[PDB]
Every structure is written in C-alpha cells, then in structure tokens.
Ligand binder design. Structure first.
Ligand SMILES: [Zn+2]
Ligand SMILES: [Zn+2]
Lengths: 84, 88
C-alpha cells in the first residue's frame, strides 16, 4: 500500500516489488540517482509505485544520454581543442 | 552548428528557447546535472553552452524524483516508533 521511493499510496498489486532479486535494476538506478542504497527492512515498504517507476526510467535515460553526449562532443573536436 | 547544439544531448537546440548553462540564472542546472550524472560540466568555447527544452524538462523531472526519494527515506524513518527505528 506505500511506495518506498515517494512514501505515498501504491496498490499492493500494480506496484512492482523493489527487492524481487530481478529488478535489482531499480535499486541500482535509485542509488545512481540519489546516492542511497535502499535496503529491504521488514518495517519499511518493499514497493515502488507506477509513477515513481516511470520517472526513474526517464531520469536514468537522461543520465546515460548526458554522459554519452559529453564523449560524442569531445570526438567532434580537433585534437588541439582537446584540453582539461 | 555550435549555436544550435544542446550540450546535454548533442542534438539540435532552439537557440532562443535553450537556457545558457554557465550564466548566474542557471547555476542550479549545472548542480542538477552533476547530482544526476556525477559530471561537473565545464564552459569551453569549442563546446555548446545551452541545454535544449526537452533536456531542461527531463532534468527538472529527474531532480524532483531525486529530492522526493531522499526526503521519503527520512520520513519513513520518522514514521517508525523508537523500538522499530532501532533496526536502522
Ligand atoms: Zn512512488
Ligand atoms: Zn538536449
């Protein structure tokens, strides 16, 4: 019934389970975004809501696009322009 | 192309609707980009110096989620009784 990521209502049905040894992707993406390793505790929620899943997928895509774009722009340059 | 390129996605950017990253009004965006990616982007004459509209929107949305997630972990910990909390 509660989302571990935004602490609001979920569904306990259409809310994916964060810790299900296969969406370790989600926990990885959360740590990459926030610098927090979320741990499975009995007294905390174990679910992510659909809205949080979607925004997380979007933020990861932008992060990867941004890193790859800095390498692509670097290659577009002449060897001289390459500095710092 | 430099004038019409997004520094964040390397694709076309509308000059007039692309905020200039390295100006005082936008220093928060360089920090948001570093929080998201781990990269501190730098102002060089030979690299684009604007963020396109599409990148600005997705970046704003990524920041909101980042902050909500950090604050949600605090709020769940306070939502516990002291005996529950002794766990973390
Ligand atoms: Zn949520
Ligand atoms: Zn862009």
């Amino acid at each position: 019934s509660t989302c571990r990521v935004c602490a609001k209502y979920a569904s306990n049905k259409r809310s994916p389970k964060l810790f299900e040894r296969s969406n370790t992707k989600m926990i990885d993406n959360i740590e990459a975004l926030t610098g927090l390793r979320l741990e499975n505790y009995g007294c905390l929620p174990d679910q992510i809501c659909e809205c949080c899943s979607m925004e997380l997928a979007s933020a990861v895509k932008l992060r990867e696009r941004c890193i790859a774009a800095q390498r692509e722009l670097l290659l577009g340059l002449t060897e001289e322009q390459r500095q710092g």
